[PDB]
Design an enzyme around this catalytic site. Structure first.
Site, PDB file in Angstrom:
ATOM      1  N   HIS A 137      -9.283 -14.971   8.010  1.00  0.00           N
ATOM      2  CA  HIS A 137     -10.163 -14.099   7.236  1.00  0.00           C
ATOM      3  C   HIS A 137      -9.451 -13.483   6.030  1.00  0.00           C
ATOM      4  O   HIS A 137      -8.210 -13.473   5.940  1.00  0.00           O
ATOM      5  CB  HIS A 137     -10.723 -12.952   8.131  1.00  0.00           C
ATOM      6  CG  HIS A 137      -9.693 -11.896   8.500  1.00  0.00           C
ATOM      7  ND1 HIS A 137      -8.801 -12.038   9.536  1.00  0.00           N
ATOM      8  CD2 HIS A 137      -9.469 -10.657   7.988  1.00  0.00           C
ATOM      9  CE1 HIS A 137      -8.061 -10.935   9.639  1.00  0.00           C
ATOM     10  NE2 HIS A 137      -8.448 -10.072   8.708  1.00  0.00           N
ATOM     11  N   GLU A 180      -2.622  -4.678 -16.197  1.00  0.00           N
ATOM     12  CA  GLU A 180      -2.879  -6.037 -16.684  1.00  0.00           C
ATOM     13  C   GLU A 180      -3.906  -6.035 -17.821  1.00  0.00           C
ATOM     14  O   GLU A 180      -3.856  -6.901 -18.702  1.00  0.00           O
ATOM     15  CB  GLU A 180      -3.334  -6.950 -15.526  1.00  0.00           C
ATOM     16  CG  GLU A 180      -2.234  -7.277 -14.497  1.00  0.00           C
ATOM     17  CD  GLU A 180      -2.540  -8.441 -13.566  1.00  0.00           C
ATOM     18  OE1 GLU A 180      -3.656  -8.999 -13.649  1.00  0.00           O
ATOM     19  OE2 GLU A 180      -1.663  -8.777 -12.733  1.00  0.00           O
ATOM     20  N   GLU A 233      15.207  -0.507  -4.438  1.00  0.00           N
ATOM     21  CA  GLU A 233      13.924  -0.961  -4.966  1.00  0.00           C
ATOM     22  C   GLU A 233      12.854   0.126  -4.888  1.00  0.00           C
ATOM     23  O   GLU A 233      11.893   0.085  -5.662  1.00  0.00           O
ATOM     24  CB  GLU A 233      13.495  -2.217  -4.202  1.00  0.00           C
ATOM     25  CG  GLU A 233      14.525  -3.351  -4.371  1.00  0.00           C
ATOM     26  CD  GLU A 233      14.045  -4.684  -3.853  1.00  0.00           C
ATOM     27  OE1 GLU A 233      14.282  -4.990  -2.663  1.00  0.00           O
ATOM     28  OE2 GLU A 233      13.437  -5.430  -4.638  1.00  0.00           O
ATOM     29  N   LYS A 276      13.097 -10.506   3.444  1.00  0.00           N
ATOM     30  CA  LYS A 276      13.421  -9.510   2.423  1.00  0.00           C
ATOM     31  C   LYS A 276      12.736  -8.185   2.713  1.00  0.00           C
ATOM     32  O   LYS A 276      11.559  -8.146   3.068  1.00  0.00           O
ATOM     33  CB  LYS A 276      12.957 -10.040   1.055  1.00  0.00           C
ATOM     34  CG  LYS A 276      12.955  -9.019  -0.118  1.00  0.00           C
ATOM     35  CD  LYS A 276      14.319  -8.982  -0.824  1.00  0.00           C
ATOM     36  CE  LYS A 276      14.375  -7.938  -1.946  1.00  0.00           C
ATOM     37  NZ  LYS A 276      13.251  -8.048  -2.925  1.00  0.00           N
ATOM     38  N   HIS A 310      -7.159 -11.804  -9.452  1.00  0.00           N
ATOM     39  CA  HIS A 310      -7.381 -10.896 -10.569  1.00  0.00           C
ATOM     40  C   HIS A 310      -8.178 -11.602 -11.667  1.00  0.00           C
ATOM     41  O   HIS A 310      -7.741 -12.639 -12.180  1.00  0.00           O
ATOM     42  CB  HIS A 310      -6.061 -10.377 -11.165  1.00  0.00           C
ATOM     43  CG  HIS A 310      -5.285  -9.448 -10.287  1.00  0.00           C
ATOM     44  ND1 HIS A 310      -3.915  -9.283 -10.415  1.00  0.00           N
ATOM     45  CD2 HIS A 310      -5.680  -8.590  -9.319  1.00  0.00           C
ATOM     46  CE1 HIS A 310      -3.503  -8.365  -9.553  1.00  0.00           C
ATOM     47  NE2 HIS A 310      -4.552  -7.944  -8.860  1.00  0.00           N
ATOM     48  N   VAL A 368      13.056  -2.031  -0.145  1.00  0.00           N
ATOM     49  CA  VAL A 368      13.418  -0.677   0.277  1.00  0.00           C
ATOM     50  C   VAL A 368      14.611  -0.221  -0.568  1.00  0.00           C
ATOM     51  O   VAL A 368      15.099  -0.956  -1.442  1.00  0.00           O
ATOM     52  CB  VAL A 368      13.740  -0.627   1.784  1.00  0.00           C
ATOM     53  CG1 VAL A 368      12.549  -1.141   2.614  1.00  0.00           C
ATOM     54  CG2 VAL A 368      14.994  -1.427   2.105  1.00  0.00           C
ATOM     55  N   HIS A 394      -7.654 -14.275  13.684  1.00  0.00           N
ATOM     56  CA  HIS A 394      -8.786 -15.054  13.199  1.00  0.00           C
ATOM     57  C   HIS A 394      -8.659 -15.247  11.691  1.00  0.00           C
ATOM     58  O   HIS A 394      -8.261 -14.321  10.982  1.00  0.00           O
ATOM     59  CB  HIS A 394     -10.107 -14.335  13.547  1.00  0.00           C
ATOM     60  CG  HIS A 394     -11.315 -15.215  13.435  1.00  0.00           C
ATOM     61  ND1 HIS A 394     -11.819 -15.911  14.511  1.00  0.00           N
ATOM     62  CD2 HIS A 394     -12.102 -15.530  12.378  1.00  0.00           C
ATOM     63  CE1 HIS A 394     -12.848 -16.646  14.118  1.00  0.00           C
ATOM     64  NE2 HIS A 394     -13.034 -16.444  12.824  1.00  0.00           N
TER      65      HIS A 394
HETATM   66  P1  LIG Z   1      -7.730  -8.565   8.531  1.00  0.00           P
HETATM   67  O1  LIG Z   1      -6.905  -8.352   9.768  1.00  0.00           O
HETATM   68  O2  LIG Z   1      -7.121  -8.434   7.159  1.00  0.00           O
HETATM   69  O3  LIG Z   1      -9.021  -7.646   8.562  1.00  0.00           O
HETATM   70  C1  LIG Z   1      -9.754  -7.438   9.760  1.00  0.00           C
HETATM   71  C2  LIG Z   1     -10.567  -6.193   9.619  1.00  0.00           C
HETATM   72  O4  LIG Z   1     -11.590  -6.098  10.634  1.00  0.00           O
HETATM   73  C3  LIG Z   1     -11.858  -4.734  10.805  1.00  0.00           C
HETATM   74  N1  LIG Z   1     -12.632  -4.579  12.023  1.00  0.00           N
HETATM   75  C4  LIG Z   1     -12.038  -4.784  13.310  1.00  0.00           C
HETATM   76  C5  LIG Z   1     -12.837  -4.610  14.541  1.00  0.00           C
HETATM   77  C6  LIG Z   1     -14.265  -4.222  14.393  1.00  0.00           C
HETATM   78  O5  LIG Z   1     -14.965  -4.080  15.353  1.00  0.00           O
HETATM   79  N2  LIG Z   1     -14.845  -4.046  13.071  1.00  0.00           N
HETATM   80  C7  LIG Z   1     -14.052  -4.221  11.861  1.00  0.00           C
HETATM   81  O6  LIG Z   1     -14.526  -4.076  10.779  1.00  0.00           O
HETATM   82  C8  LIG Z   1     -10.488  -4.096  10.815  1.00  0.00           C
HETATM   83  O7  LIG Z   1     -10.530  -2.702  10.577  1.00  0.00           O
HETATM   84  C9  LIG Z   1      -9.747  -4.899   9.734  1.00  0.00           C
HETATM   85  O8  LIG Z   1      -9.768  -4.215   8.480  1.00  0.00           O
HETATM   86 ZN   LIG Z   2      -2.572 -10.164 -11.747  1.00  0.00          ZN
END
Ligand SMILES: *P(=O)(O)OC[C@H]1O[C@@H](N2CCC(=O)NC2=O)[C@H](O)[C@@H]1O
Ligand SMILES: [Zn+2]
Ligand SMILES: *P(=O)(O)OC[C@H]1O[C@@H](N2CCC(=O)NC2=O)[C@H](O)[C@@H]1O
Ligand SMILES: [Zn+2]
Lengths: 344, 344
Positions: free
Chosen positions: A162, A178, A316, A310, A277, A313, A160
């Protein structure tokens, strides 16, 4: 000015913003002994806890939201607990107490879109939400870290669209680096470090990727990941909420163009980590922060194809960063790519 | 002394050797939306360019070697080119010339062995070769970096047992950080940093993994990877060639025990990057380096099983390192594991 030529087998380049060196090995080849199933994403799944209407791990039900949605992470790395003393004070065993807030921010209610496939007004809604959460959490915390971690190659299992927002009682290590470098540059030269860097890269041309009325994108001289970019405004701007409506619409447009170029490079949905930032907030937000310039970093792992990446590891992890592809080669390839998204 | 308790949802810990902070989130859970074919390795393959008798990419034929074998990398990150001027000197575009030598070192002539399955005399031959190459390349270069990158999860595609050695005209960033911190500690306290750290961890006990007559292994207070360890001698020793025969045999024995424990943790061949850090060499090798203590680091990616790993991405690329498993939990689990290698 004169181009930076690839006339040696190895040299080192300096990052003045984070104070580190990179080994560059131009024209180095690879002869690996051995080489290095994408199911379709449904628009809505009631069992995906980021979807409108879905149940999360704390038992709450997401609303039927329209554009963005912000909620507290149910598995948080930081929580707003009561202040407490530092649990250890010996020279070799130093520890400090900490507190904070971790949010998840959905970009859109449909799970089968990514940012380069969203419209400019849909991306503007994301920009407005980034500004709002920075204002709100910055009232209580000195550092608000917006970041997006995209793709299974980065360990993200939920497709999804996000990002995440982690606000902390401490200034994290990279923010401290920084702060130190930008403060020292301004005291010595009388201009912000990244404003002078922008001016010089516009004159030198060869590391530019995109330019617009209010923004630019470039591959930094000191980049460590193959197609790494830096995105920053042309005006001197300390923090994200200061962007004007025109600057916010233009940010939405140039992000759409950059991320579409990235998808076109290897004709795949391009993975990366990115984030923003800006000047520290919190109780000292009213102090002098004129040395700061708002900017974003993009750190993508792909190197030669959708499958060839890349690995940071080995040398690095034990010595310093190393790259083969030069930043000038990377930027040239990115400039040529179309802004019309590929179709299978 | 008193144990360091897991009584908060988050705190930060300091690394005094490389000068950085780590966010520790004890007891944090994970609920991922989706989850995260090993062919048998022939003992000899004439097409594997690390095998005895095989042809390499430069057309040369490997000899019929007995234990270790050292050769120049055919695709080198550094080459011993003639000195030359620095190609750029502006404040924001700083670059320096560089030169060096990159070797590959096979551990054993058979491709179907790894270090924990080798005998103690076979591992002693590896230790002797590490000392020899440090002496030889250290005569001309101020930094000699031995490192091993093991496993497909680390991007290593050739399964033959081996390491790499990169010697450089420059002191790499991590070596400069460890020089600065060790020098400052000795000036202030009158003892080497890591000798005092060893003394204290032997008294505190809870992060120890293995102890022997001449060595110890522990999970550092400030560790960033889940089952990261630090390996160092009990005697004050600046560089690897100074180890006595008894110290070299005991190093071979304790490495065999550590790496066997690592394989037993998730009953799989355990991937990692590791390497050695000792006092700088080269033209200043005769100066005062009493603040240095020889040591090795191990940085492994696996977290909960043979398939479930840690990704150092996202917040860790934009702010600072973060972990859930505590160093005290990690060390406890490692101590309990048998020293007899598992069998399917
Ligand atoms: P992205 O994949 O960066 O972040 C998704 C976050 O959602 C959190 N979830 C997942 C399922 C839930 O029921 N609650 C919740 O907060 C998950 O820990 C990821 O950080
Ligand atoms: Zn920066
Ligand atoms: P490990 O996998 O860490 O290092 C193996 C190195 O061997 C180099 N090769 C491969 C094939 C060849 O013909 N010559 C050679 O030097 C390869 O580039 C790896 O660095
Ligand atoms: Zn070290």
């Amino acid at each position: 000015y004169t181009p930076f030529l690839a006339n040696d087998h190895q040299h080192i380049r300096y990052n003045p913003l984070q104070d580190e060196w990179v080994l560059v090995s131009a024209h180095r080849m690879k002869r690996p002994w051995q080489g290095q199933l994408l199911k379709t994403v449904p628009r809505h799944d009631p069992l995906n806890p980021l979807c409108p209407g879905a149940i999360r791990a704390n038992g709450e039900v997401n609303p039927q939201y329209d554009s963005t949605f912000l909620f507290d992470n149910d598995f948080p790395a930081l929580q707003p607990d009561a202040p407490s003393p530092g649990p250890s004070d010996h020279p070799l065993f130093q520890a400090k107490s900490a507190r904070g807030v971790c949010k998840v921010m959905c970009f859109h209610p449909w799970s089968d879109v990514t940012l380069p496939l969203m419209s400019v007004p849909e991306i503007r809604a994301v920009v407005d939400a980034w500004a709002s959460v920075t204002e709100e959490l910055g009232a209580q915390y000195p550092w608000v870290q917006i970041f997006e971690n995209k793709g299974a190659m980065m360990g993200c299992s939920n497709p999804h669209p996000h990002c995440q927002v982690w606000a902390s009682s401490f200034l994290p290590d990279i923010a401290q680096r920084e702060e130190r470098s930008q403060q020292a540059y301004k005291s010595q030269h009388g201009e912000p470090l990244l404003m002078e860097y922008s001016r010089q890269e516009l004159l030198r041309k060869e590391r530019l990727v995109l330019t617009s009325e209010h923004w630019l994108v470039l591959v930094p001289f000191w980049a460590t990941w193959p197609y790494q970019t830096l995105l920053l405004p042309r005006r001197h701007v300390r923090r994200l909420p200061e962007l004007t409506p025109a600057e916010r619409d233009d940010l939405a447009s140039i992000m759409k163009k950059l991320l579409t170029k990235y998808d076109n490079l290897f004709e795949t949905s391009f993975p990366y980590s990115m984030g923003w930032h800006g000047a520290p907030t919190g109780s000292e937000a009213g102090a002098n922060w004129d040395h700061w310039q708002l900017h974003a970093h993009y750190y993508p792992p792909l190197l030669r194809s959708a499958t060839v990446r890349k690995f940071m590891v080995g040398y690095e992890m034990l010595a310093q960063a190393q790259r083969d592809l030069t930043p000038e080669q990377a930027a040239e390839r990115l400039r040529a790519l179309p802004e019309v998204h590929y179709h299978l």
